[PDB]
Amino acid sequence: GLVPRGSHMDVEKLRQLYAAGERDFSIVDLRGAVLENINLSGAILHGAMLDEANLQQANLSRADLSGATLNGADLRGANLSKADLSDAILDNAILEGAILDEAVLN
Structure with missing residues (x-):
């Protein structure tokens, strides 16, 4: 039941x-x-x-991604609506087809 940190998380465990x-x-x-x-x-x-x-096609709606790094992430068709992108690094992420409506920016 603990969330693994300090190592690459297994997506199955996530x-x-x-x-x-x-x-x-x-x-x-x-x-x-x-x-x-x-x-x-x-x-x-x-x-x-x-x-x-x-x-790709991830649902990240209302996710708190503040201060998260997403350099070069493939967010094609991803739902980022109402997500918090305050302080996030979206440098070079692919957003084609992604829903940015009401996402929080600085």
Whole structure:
């Protein structure tokens, strides 16, 4: 039931924790992760590392991604509506087809 930190998180473990009701995935390492199609809506991902992740068609609606790094992440068709992108690094992420409506920016 603990959220693994300080190592690359297993996506299967992420999915199980999320399904168990866990929402706090602050500071997790999901770099290069295959997260295609995943529902992480409402997930706290503050300061998390998602650089280069496959987030194609991911549901990240209302996710707290404040201070998260998403360099080069593949967010094609991803739902970022009402997500918090305060302080996030979206440098070079692909957003074609992504829903940015009401996402929070600075």
